[PDB]
Amino acid sequence: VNKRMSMVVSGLTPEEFMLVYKFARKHHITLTNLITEETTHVVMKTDAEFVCERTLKYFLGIAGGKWVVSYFWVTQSIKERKMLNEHDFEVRGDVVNGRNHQGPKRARESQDRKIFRGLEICCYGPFTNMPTDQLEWMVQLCGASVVKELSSFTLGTGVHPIVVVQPDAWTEDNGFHAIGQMCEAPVVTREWVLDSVALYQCQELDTYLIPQIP
Amino acid sequence: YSRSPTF
């Protein structure tokens, strides 16, 4: 069948979005507020060097191997009144993981070798600023298998379980340290997932590990 | 607005 251009925007003011809306309207490009499997283009606010902030749409964009391109793609296409090529405007990095890590490009090219493949991940709440099912969708897009309960982890030397938590979300008790007594798997911060996705390369769990009381 | 959070 025909999968058609379909955009979402991120990090744009309500104003800048209007320009995109006009752009989408002129060229009859589908524009939506919510990102989906169908979405092909994620238009990010960036600087002159195509570096951008890390938003939910940014992560999901890369994870889905979609076109993650700069807002300049839209404005420049307007200034030339033509549909410019995405390749020229693909974001090269973000503020956090490097300004040219080429995460988006690698994500487009590694859809047969997903980073989280062969892993089972449980997103152990609570979290903030990012719905748990969105985080779960993010890993799922990256080949990881999602697990709801710590007791739902699949056993076997061939399956690797990972528990992901956000320490800042917990309150005044090192509860997150007590998880290890519930099941044996590595407990890592949400940053591990976010860094891995942004670069679209599976980071070593070392720097993200959380001390589990015996 | 209620602009999207950043990580």
Sign of dihedral through CA atoms A94, A98, A104, A107?
negative
CA A154 to chain centre: 25
- List phi, psi (to 5°) of A211: -50, 120
Strand partners, A210: none
DSSP run (H or E) holding A94: strand A93-94
Give B6's contacts in chain A (Cβ within 8 Å): 11, 53-55
Domains of chain A with bracketed CATH: 1-110 (3.40.50.10190), 111-214 (3.40.50.10190)
Amino acid at A43: V
DSSP of A5-22: -EEEEES--HHHHHHHHH
What six digits make up the tokens of A158? Answer: 């061939």
Contact assignment for A55 to B6 by CB distance below 8 Å: yes
Exposure string of A128-153, with b = 16+ CB inside 10 Å and e = fewer, is eebeeeebbbbbbbbbbbbbeeeeeb
Measured CA to CA, the distance from residue B6 to residue A212 in angstroms comes to 29
Q: Are A100 and A142 in contact (CB under 8 A)?
A: no
Measured CA to CA, the distance from residue A9 to residue A35 in angstroms comes to 9
Nearest to A116 by CA among A62, A69, A179, A176: A62
Amino acid at A4: R
Mention every residue, 6+ apart, whose C-beta is less than 8 A from residue A74.
Answer: A19, A20, A23, A43
Mention every residue, 6+ apart, whose C-beta is less than 8 A from residue A35.
Answer: A8, A42, A56, A57, A60, A61, A64
Which strands sit side by side in the sheet containing A41-44, from one edge to the other? A30-31, A6-10, A41-44, A67-70
Measured CA to CA, the distance from residue A52 to residue A46 in angstroms comes to 4
Give A11's contacts in chain B (Cβ within 8 Å): 3-4, 6
Min Cα–Cα distance to chain A from B4, Å: 7
Measured CA to CA, the distance from residue A118 to residue A156 in angstroms comes to 12
DSSP 8-state symbol, A99: S
CA A144 to chain centre: 13
- C-alpha distances out from residue A136 to A51, A75, A190, A195, Å: 26, 34, 11, 15
Report the relative pairing of strands A93-94 and A51-52 from DSSP bridges.
parallel
DSSP run (H or E) holding A198: helix A190-198
End-to-end CA distance of chain B: 18
Q: Are A195 and A182 in contact (CB under 8 A)?
A: no
Q: Are A36 and A63 in contact (CB under 8 A)?
A: no
Measured CA to CA, the distance from residue A202 to residue A189 in angstroms comes to 14
Give A56's contacts in chain B (Cβ within 8 Å): 4-5, 7
3-state secondary structure of A73: helix
